[PDB]
Amino acid sequence: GHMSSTPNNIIPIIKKESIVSLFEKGIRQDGRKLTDYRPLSITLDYAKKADGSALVKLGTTMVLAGTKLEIDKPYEDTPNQGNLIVNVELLPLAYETFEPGPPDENAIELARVVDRSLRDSKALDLTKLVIEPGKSVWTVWLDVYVLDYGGNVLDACTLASVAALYNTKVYKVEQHISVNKNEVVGKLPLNYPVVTISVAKVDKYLVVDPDLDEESIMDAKISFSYTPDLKIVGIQKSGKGSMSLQDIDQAENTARSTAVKLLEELKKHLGI
Amino acid sequence: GHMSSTPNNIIPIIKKESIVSLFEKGIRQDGRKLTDYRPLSITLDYAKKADGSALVKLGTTMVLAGTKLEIDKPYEDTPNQGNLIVNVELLPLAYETFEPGPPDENAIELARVVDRSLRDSKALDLTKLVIEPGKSVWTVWLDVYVLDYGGNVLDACTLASVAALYNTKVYKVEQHISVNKNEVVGKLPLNYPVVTISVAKVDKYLVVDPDLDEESIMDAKISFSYTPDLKIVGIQKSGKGSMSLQDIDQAENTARSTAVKLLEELKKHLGI
Amino acid sequence: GHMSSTPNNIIPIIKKESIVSLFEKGIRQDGRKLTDYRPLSITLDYAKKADGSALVKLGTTMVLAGTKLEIDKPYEDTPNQGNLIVNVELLPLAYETFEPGPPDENAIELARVVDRSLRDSKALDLTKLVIEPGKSVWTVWLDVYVLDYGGNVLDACTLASVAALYNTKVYKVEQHISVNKNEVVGKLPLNYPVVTISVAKVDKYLVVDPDLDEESIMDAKISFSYTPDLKIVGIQKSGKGSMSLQDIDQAENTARSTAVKLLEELKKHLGI
Amino acid sequence: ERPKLILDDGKRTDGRKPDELRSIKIELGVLKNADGSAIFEMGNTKAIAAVYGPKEMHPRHLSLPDRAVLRVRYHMTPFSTDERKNPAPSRREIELSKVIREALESAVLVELFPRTAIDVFTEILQADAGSRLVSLMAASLALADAGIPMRDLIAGVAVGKADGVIILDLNETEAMWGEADMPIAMMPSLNQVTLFQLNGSMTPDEFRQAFDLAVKGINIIYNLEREALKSKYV
Amino acid sequence: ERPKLILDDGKRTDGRKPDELRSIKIELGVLKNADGSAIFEMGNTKAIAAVYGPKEMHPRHLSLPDRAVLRVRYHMTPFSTDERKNPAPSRREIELSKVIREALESAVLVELFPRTAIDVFTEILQADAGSRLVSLMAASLALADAGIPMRDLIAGVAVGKADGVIILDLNETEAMWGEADMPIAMMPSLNQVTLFQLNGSMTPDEFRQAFDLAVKGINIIYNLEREALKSKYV
Amino acid sequence: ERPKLILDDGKRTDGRKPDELRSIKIELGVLKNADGSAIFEMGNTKAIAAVYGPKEMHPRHLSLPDRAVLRVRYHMTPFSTDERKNPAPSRREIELSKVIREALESAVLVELFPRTAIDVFTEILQADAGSRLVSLMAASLALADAGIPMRDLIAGVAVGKADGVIILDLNETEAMWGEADMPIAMMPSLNQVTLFQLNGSMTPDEFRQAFDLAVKGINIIYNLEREALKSKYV
Amino acid sequence: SQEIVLQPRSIVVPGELLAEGEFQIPWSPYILKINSKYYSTVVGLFDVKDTQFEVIPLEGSFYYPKINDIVIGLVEDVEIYGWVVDIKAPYKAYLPASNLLGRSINVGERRYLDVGDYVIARIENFDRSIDPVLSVKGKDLGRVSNGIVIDIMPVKVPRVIGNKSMYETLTSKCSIFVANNGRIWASRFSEEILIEAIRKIENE
Amino acid sequence: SQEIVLQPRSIVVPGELLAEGEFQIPWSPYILKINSKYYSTVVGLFDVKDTQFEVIPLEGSFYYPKINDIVIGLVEDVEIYGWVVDIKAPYKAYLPASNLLGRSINVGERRYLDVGDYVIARIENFDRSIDPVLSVKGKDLGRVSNGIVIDIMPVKVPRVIGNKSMYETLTSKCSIFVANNGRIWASRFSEEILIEAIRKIENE
Ligand code: NA
Ligand code: NA
Ligand code: NA
């Protein structure tokens, strides 16, 4: 048994004013526009024993995603599909108040939001992960480790996840069925990338890619996932506060505009 | 690892006297006789996605039992029997001090006492739950949820359990083996009902079906299970206090007399 | 998730001096030499439903080890070996501050050190525990219960473990595969005994088989495992304090000299 | 996907038009011990909620010095689903407990009771889609029944898309086989959204069409909520 | 059921008459750290118990202001049973820990030590039926060995029915295959029952016959308990 | 055993001589929130460490009145190993967390901060043997990066035996198939050993030969540690 | 530009608009002001007294402490320097040993109040920062020996009193005191005033 | 038989030998004496002032409390009798209500300091046995209304001050106060003194 409790980065009264002092001019503390992401770095193949991996740095947020593939029986009700299992860990390395333990509700939410966006996007078509229909399929274990919690971890987890998937080597399968790790025969087949765009409501402003301070003062945030044709493939409101109908409408319009740019950047990093 | 600790509904000194003030006349606060159950309501098929269910209201105690059947392999040492698994949950809904978590020792005891009374009564003959001897049998998952803790939850759990079992639909099994939930072919086969009768010792009095206040002031309680031929098919003393040999003798005599009436009421509710 | 924390038998300033007051003469409180074990008693077949067992008393330390064998499939990567599973429990019976729970880090360490010494010694050759190559093998469950924590529990766990293994009955296996417990066909085949010798550093002295008081004041301890040819088959430094290179060199020389005597005593107890 | 979800007459698999809600039944004050309680049924989806508090939260280092802590559980009974659900909390239940709690946090006037906990326990008795919203509304109603001040009631509904058609208040068939499922809950008198999620996929124009339809359903549900609370007095 | 439990000579599978107890061996003061300790053997059933306290219970919000809290563990070793028992507490062990604790609560003079805990730990070393009673009696004796005031010792025995015959002090064969198993424990000098359970089935006349036989066995066991406690002084 | 570990040219499976270390790379200050942080790579074994504190440890009955408590985690990521490692702590991780903590306890000047906790978290990103030492050294360096006083840095290396040859700084092949693996860590300027373990088997003369070789490797590693800490200033 | 939206004595529910415009109403937990609009926060009865309005809560089992209120508490713990008392609030109350004794605790001294006793006390200190402190200084304050104590919803207390009209009707049945925290100090036949109490709570 | 091993202003690391011989140095957390040898315990700068030496720490985000130090705290809780204050130390600080008010707490009395306020205070009590007690008695001590508060590594505070040379260079840019606990009280353009601060912490 278990339950969700109200949790607080106690922020000084003075500091809040300073954080929003330039929003009127369309810019934040760090000089960036309300619609700008922080500087993004994606390092592929960072975790050398992962089947694929990506280290994502998004401002001071750092996430390492890694995959490992295994041969399994398909679940009996989906004999013609492989499997995707997403786990996110908010490491105690990442932030002072994060003590160790199994995934808490925040890590579980992040995993599930990411999983839905990957699965519902149809970026990873699990029917492609069949080896022998009804007998052997690939299971894709995606493990996503937040190493440095610098704000907007969800967007970074999405980027890391997609990059790690695109980086995933597929090894030769030998019949007698064994995996031969001396022979890479392919890469995991993705249809396209996906991005998740989080918009935080801060008083009368909407801000893309909130940092730690901005997340400390926001009313709420809403995250929108997109594929390149700009279909919406996931939404999640989070936080204690509410938003108006109009706030959400505006947030989506703003998230979509940013998604176009973020997708193009991500593709450059992936080599597609 | 785990251990059992002394736990307390801190009851005022004044209130106790009032609770027993009418026992001399053979009646309690609520006007009922020392040997009377509280008003009982049994609503069958309450949980519409359960294979069978019953909502039992016994005074202010409320218990919802539900069953689900699944096809499984018999345990290797009982190839010619199906299975019965009983779980009881004391929901945090039920009482103020019940916090959420897995079953505590009280919920586990209740489950095990109920299970023994069902199994030892031979009311549910598990040899009848075989589909293909040594290959496929029914597992009966019985889940018993205490929604409102108003005293004598054990007796209510027994009634709910028996009623849910009698209410349990059995679906067509198709050979190729699959369950076809579009076709009800039977009801779970019971030999008879069972009841559990709890007698609380309150000073020099024995009281049937104690309420919350009476349970707060009792020395101990003893519960006796009966089938219609009035065989005793389970006994459990519970509580911190002891009882005399003579108290137990009297309690059984009193429990048995009440069981006759409770069985007849239960049968009316079940339509048998 | 989980982590290791600094834990303290708060010992009086006065008591420490007394504990070491005779080390200069080569003796401790109890009259024993720095290189002497405490009085050892090994009672075989103590736990009558165990396949083998041994109750070891080493001073006031008391450990009961028991085995149970089961037929299992070999792990797929070792088709031509049986299995050994070692579990140690520091029972709350054993010491005042030991509360109940699953194995804590101390019990897990003890299990793993013991397991390595048994396995790495090659005392128990698991290839001998095959019934049908690639289909059925023995699993040896070794469960080691510290009943009285009187110091140097590791050495006592090793002795108990080895004695229980040597005491382990093997039953007739019947083909149809079932174990017939009415017929003992053998004893578990061991190549030789193993011992673990723990040396505690106490100021400028090294002490074999520290008692509870000596463990309360030691800087650190180092344990060395030996077979009869006096190969070293395991080492483990434990404790908060460090030791010099020279301390360890000396400790090993001293541990080995004691091992010769402890092995001979152990063999007398085992009847080999 | 497999079963047809919009039939040739333009109606759904259970007889409803695209803009028609399932039938709603609300009962209040159903539990004797709980400070407040409610049963909420929306078609074959049914939840019970029990509220306790505010009461002093013992730790007490997990309390907040300026407001109450909400403690909230979303749990499904094992017999609430087509096939038995294991009673151990799933990742889904963990997520949904947080989402429901955060929805309640915008509504409950927690600053009235510093250092306390308000416990909100919901159980899904029958699951046929929309159970996170039915639990949330049963909770909102149980909090009202308990006399715990709130800025507004919360009403919610899932909209979605089935065989290309935007639809209101999905059943399990539509949730399982449709293209999109978007639960929305609001404080309707305050124009504020408390819960908002989408799974599946929608174009941005479909999203806006669905959001608009949800608001219509929410306003119907809210009036039923208000009328249910008043009925024992009226 | 399968094996014959009452043979043609009227004796049981281990040679005993229906009204004959298994052999009993009691040892006290077996552990050096424990404040009190005991080993109790009844035929092939054997338990060890260790007692600590009374000592201040740290929380301290789980203490009682007028009496000590008893903390009690019934646990079976993995090698105590015919086939390995997994060392994780089972539902059975959970139930039996409570039943044993509640039996000890009537005996231990807990009101002497407000705000403390008295810890009682039992381990079943060999299980051949009646282990809940052997653990309980080993505990009662360990508490005596620890000098913790009690109103009386507790003695207990299981009676039952095998092939229709009422029998005293069941072994595992009888427990497994007989018709009824009824563990009873008392404070014999006080005429008070501390533990009482039945599994299986008995007519009410059989129940009374069995209860009467149990009392006879209990009085034999009690005198052995008293004599064991006195022996180191006598 | 199966693969040859010492080839005909006298070199090891990765090209190294018996007394040659793998390549080492150290990075400090890699995490923004951590009070100190480090990445340590020794060949294909790579760990990251983060340090927080000293800070008041809340309980507070788990604090020590004369010194800080170290809280230490050794954990391997699921993708750090040839086959996926389940993320739940294994018995191995539990043991290694204690061994690493106890190694740090000799070094950290804990008596400076009574009643506090110093949290040390390590993650193995790539495991190719020696990961307990690489985690330990990354920790030692992260503590330095955090400004937490220590008597010395800790440097460590595993020595062992492969095909009869005493070897320095094992890779996973040697760890898996060799005869002995002996991790040693020291405070080198103080001549003190902080961690010392052996698995496998060695004669006592082999043990001394290996121990001597380890000290040589440790002194090389230590100078790299010192130079890495100084580099951002030098 | 001012108006009340609802008739007086309207049944009201959370979020229900009561008034638009600028009123000068004392803050109340039952009414939320958002700019120039006022909303009920509870299930209640909207009541307009003069130019001012209020919401009378119909639900709630908790008492909110008010300084100088008279309560009936139930003693739940005896501590070193006083007693923890349940006064049916979200916060436990405390009665200092020194208040009851008129002096400091003596060396080696549950004789006056132990767990389970009812005690009639005035709330001496309370604010948003602290749990209520109790006093037993006044007359007829202290431990309750005889009689009974009937519980009601605290929101009902003004209705059980009624220019003390209802106080008088009950006592025409029998002697009762109606505490601020929804507890009522009160032959065995006439003890069935609780039949009446339960009627005030379900027919108001 | 005395010698310093290293040149002055040497970069030093834990375990690094600084000196051999008998010196009479005040104990310092940054230097460990083992018989006649002295070692750095930190990453730092070895400095020799006269016949005495010290290590200047270059790392560390914590402030070690010192009696009579002036700190900028952040209020984290309001308790019955005072406030818990974060002063960026391993220990939380406490400000008694009685110190701020000049009198004892009145009946029924966050008006002066609530969660989130900065407060400038002197450390009044501290030792190895207790958390720091704060005072706001001095002038210009108390709640900070206007301005900002910039955080630095506390080990940097002497460098931000510099015969107060650096204090003067900054204020030539703008008014700043440099607290002992690595916090600095200080138009929106000139608010970019924090560009300079971050330079003192990464170029010292
Ligand atoms: Na949750
Ligand atoms: Na239990
Ligand atoms: Na550990």
DSSP chain F: --S-SB-TTS-BTTS--TT-PPPEEEEE---SSSSEEEEEEETTEEEEEEEEEEEE-SS-TTSBTTBPEEEEEEEE-TTSSSSPPPSSPPHHHHHHHHHHHHHHHTTB-GGGSTTEEEEEEEEEEE-SS-HHHHHHHHHHHHHHHTT--BS---EEEEEEEETTEEEES--HHHHHHSSEEEEEEEEGGGTEEEEEEEEE-B-HHHHHHHHHHHHHHHHHHHHHHHHHHHHTT-
> Distance, CA A4 to ligand 1 centroid (Å)?
4
Q: Which ligand number lies closest to the CA of residue B4? A: 2
d(CA B138, CA B143): 16
Instruction: Using alpha carbons, select from E71, E146, E65 the residue that is nearest to residue E105.
Output: E71
Task: Determine the Cα angle at B251 with ends B249 and B257, to 5°.
Answer: 110
Chain A environment of C5 (Cβ under 8 Å): none
Q: Per the domain annotation, does A217 fall within a domain?
A: yes
Ion ligand 1: protein residues whose beta carbon lies under 5 Å: A 4, 105; D 94, 97-98
d(CA F17, CA F129): 17
Distance of CA B191 to the CA centre of its chain: 17
Experimental method: X-ray
Q: Per the domain annotation, does A67 fall within a domain?
A: yes
Q: Per the domain annotation, does A2 fall within a domain?
A: no
Largest CA distance in chain E: 61
Yes or no: domain G1-59 corresponds to CATH 3.30.70.20: no
Distance of CA C75 to the CA centre of its chain: 26
d(CA C249, CA F106): 19
* A70/F79 Cβ within 8 A: no
* C87/E79 Cβ within 8 A: no
> Distance, CA E107 to ligand 2 centroid (Å)?
19
Q: For residues B188 and B170, is the Cβ–Cβ distance under 8 A?
A: yes
The beta strand positions in chain A, using DSSP E, are 4-5, 40-44, 52-58, 61-72, 83-90, 130-132, 136-148, 169-174, 178-187, 195-202, 205-208, 220-226, 232-238, 243-244
Strand-pair category, F155-162 with F116-126: unpaired
Partners of B207 in the β-ladder: B200
> Distance, CA D172 to ligand 3 centroid (Å)?
46
d(CA F116, CA F65): 9
Q: Per the domain annotation, does B262 fall within a domain?
A: yes
CA torsion angle for F146, F151, F155, F156 (degrees, to 10)?
Answer: -120
Superfamily for the G146-204 domain? K Homology domain, type 1 (3.30.1370.10)
Give whole-number Cα distances, E202 to D115, H24, H170, in Å: 56, 90, 94
The values of phi and psi at residue B24, to 5°, are -45, -40
Q: For residues F183 and F195, is the Cβ–Cβ distance under 8 A?
A: yes
Strand-pair category, F155-162 with F165-168: antiparallel
H/E/C letters for each residue in D43-75?
CCEEEEEEEEEEEECCCCCCCECCECEEEEEEE
> How many separate domains does chain B show?
1
* Tokens representing residue H132 in the block: 């720091």
Neighbours of B97 (CB within 10 A): 12
Domains G1-59 and G146-204 share a fold: no
> Distance, CA D30 to ligand 1 centroid (Å)?
26
* Tokens representing residue D170 in the block: 């999905």
- Helix B245-270 and helix E204-231: axis angle, to 10°? 140
Resolution of the structure, angstroms: 1.8
Instruction: Using alpha carbons, select from H7, D37, A242, D74 the residue that is nearest to residue B60.
Output: D37
Q: For residues F48 and F122, is the Cβ–Cβ distance under 8 A?
A: yes
**What residue of F is the nearest CA neighbor of H128?**
F114
Cβ–Cβ contact H110 with G under 8 A? yes
Tell me the nearest-neighbour CA distance from F41 into chain H, angstroms. 20
Give whole-number Cα distances, H74 to A11, C39, C178, H67, H84, in Å: 9, 62, 72, 18, 9
Neighbours of H202 (CB within 10 A): 10
- Helix F131-145 and helix F204-231: axis angle, to 10°? 30
Chains that touch B (3 or more CB pairs under 8 A): A, C, D, E, G
Strand-pair category, E69-76 with E116-126: parallel
Partner-chain residue, chosen from D54, D149, D152, that has the shortest CB–CB distance to G90: D54
> Distance, CA C105 to ligand 3 centroid (Å)?
5
> Distance, CA E86 to ligand 2 centroid (Å)?
17
Give, rounded to a whole angstrom, the gap between the first and last alpha carbons of chain B.
Answer: 45
Which residue type occupies C195?
V
* D147/G57 Cβ within 8 A: yes
Q: For residues A176 and A134, is the Cβ–Cβ distance under 8 A?
A: no
d(CA A252, CA A261): 15
Chains that touch A (3 or more CB pairs under 8 A): B, C, D, F, H
d(CA E42, CA E22): 6
* A105/D204 Cβ within 8 A: no
* G74/B10 Cβ within 8 A: yes
With an 8 Å CB cutoff and a minimum of 3 pairs, decide whether chains H and F touch. yes
Instruction: Using alpha carbons, select from F113, F133, F144 the residue that is nearest to residue F45.
Output: F133
* G15/D152 Cβ within 8 A: yes
Chain C environment of E87 (Cβ under 8 Å): 87, 89, 143
The beta strand positions in chain G, using DSSP E, are 3-4, 10-12, 17-20, 31-34, 37-40, 44-49, 52-57, 70-78, 82-86, 93-96, 118-127, 130-135, 142-143, 149-151, 177-178, 183-185
Partners of E131 in the β-ladder: none
Which residue type occupies G151?
D
Query: Looking at beta carbons, which pairs linking E8-14 to residues 24 or more positions away fall under 8 Å?
Result: E12/E162, E12/E167, E12/E171, E12/E174, E13/E171, E13/E173, E13/E174, E14/E43, E14/E171, E14/E173
Q: For residues E66 and E114, is the Cβ–Cβ distance under 8 A?
A: yes
With an 8 Å CB cutoff and a minimum of 3 pairs, decide whether chains C and E touch. yes
Query: Looking at beta carbons, which pairs linking A72-80 to residues 24 or more positions away fall under 8 Å?
Result: A72/A136, A72/A137, A72/A138, A72/A139, A73/A135, A73/A136, A73/A137, A74/A130, A74/A134, A74/A135, A74/A136, A74/A137, A78/A126, A79/A133, A79/A134, A80/A127, A80/A130, A80/A133, A80/A134
Partner-chain residue, chosen from E73, E91, E102, that has the shortest CB–CB distance to B239: E102
3-state secondary structure of H185: strand
* Tokens representing residue E186 in the block: 């008392």
- Residues of C near B (Cβ–Cβ under 8 Å) read 92, 100-102
User: Hey, what domains does chain E have and what are their CATH numbers?
Assistant: 19-234 (3.30.230.70)
The values of phi and psi at residue D133, to 5°, are -80, -40
**C-alpha neighbours within 13 Å on the C-beta side of residue E230:** 8
Instruction: Using alpha carbons, select from C121, C269, C150 the residue that is nearest to residue C213.
Output: C150
Q: Per the domain annotation, does B1 fall within a domain?
A: no
- Domain H60-145: which topology? OB fold (Dihydrolipoamide Acetyltransferase, E2P) (2.40.50)
Chain B environment of D121 (Cβ under 8 Å): 91-93, 100
**C-alpha neighbours within 13 Å on the C-beta side of residue F155:** 25
**What residue of B is the nearest CA neighbor of G147?**
B14
Sort residue F22 into left (φ over 0), alpha (ψ -120 to 50) or beta: beta
Neighbours of H159 (CB within 10 A): 15
Instruction: Using alpha carbons, select from G121, C141, A4 the residue that is nearest to residue D92.
Output: A4
* H30/F189 Cβ within 8 A: no
Q: Per the domain annotation, does C7 fall within a domain?
A: no
CATH number of the domain bearing residue C36: 3.30.230.70
DSSP H or E segment with residue C114 = helix C105-120
Tokens 């439990």 locate to E5
Q: Which ligand number lies closest to the CA of residue F95? A: 3
Cβ–Cβ contact B180 with G under 8 A? no
Q: For residues H42 and F147, is the Cβ–Cβ distance under 8 A?
A: yes
Cis peptide bond prior to F60, omega within 30° of 0: yes
Q: Per the domain annotation, does A7 fall within a domain?
A: no
d(CA C152, CA B193): 59
With an 8 Å CB cutoff and a minimum of 3 pairs, decide whether chains E and A touch. no
Which residue type occupies E4?
K
**C-alpha neighbours within 13 Å on the C-beta side of residue C210:** 23
Q: For residues H152 and H184, is the Cβ–Cβ distance under 8 A?
A: yes
Tell me the nearest-neighbour CA distance from H90 into chain D, angstroms. 18
Q: For residues C47 and E47, is the Cβ–Cβ distance under 8 A?
A: no
Chain A environment of H144 (Cβ under 8 Å): 14
With an 8 Å CB cutoff and a minimum of 3 pairs, decide whether chains B and E touch. yes
Largest CA distance in chain F: 61
Chains that touch E (3 or more CB pairs under 8 A): B, C, G
The values of phi and psi at residue F146, to 5°, are -90, -10
Cβ–Cβ contact B114 with E under 8 A? no
Helix-then-strand count for chain A, H and E: 5, 14
Instruction: Using alpha carbons, select from F141, F108, F117 the residue that is nearest to residue C5.
Output: F117
Q: Per the domain annotation, does A1 fall within a domain?
A: no
**What residue of A is the nearest CA neighbor of D184?**
A237
* G116/B18 Cβ within 8 A: no
* E105/B6 Cβ within 8 A: yes
Q: Which residues of H68-90 are buried (b: 16+ CB within 10 A; e: fewer)?
A: ebbbbbbbbbbeeebbbbbbbbb
- Residues of A near C (Cβ–Cβ under 8 Å) read 92, 100-102
Distance of CA F102 to the CA centre of its chain: 12
Task: Determine the Cα angle at D110 with ends D106 and D114, to 5°.
Answer: 150
Chain B environment of A1 (Cβ under 8 Å): 92, 100-102
Chain G environment of D219 (Cβ under 8 Å): none
Tell me the nearest-neighbour CA distance from C243 into chain E, angstroms. 30
Positive or negative, the Cα torsion across A198, A202, A204, A209?
negative
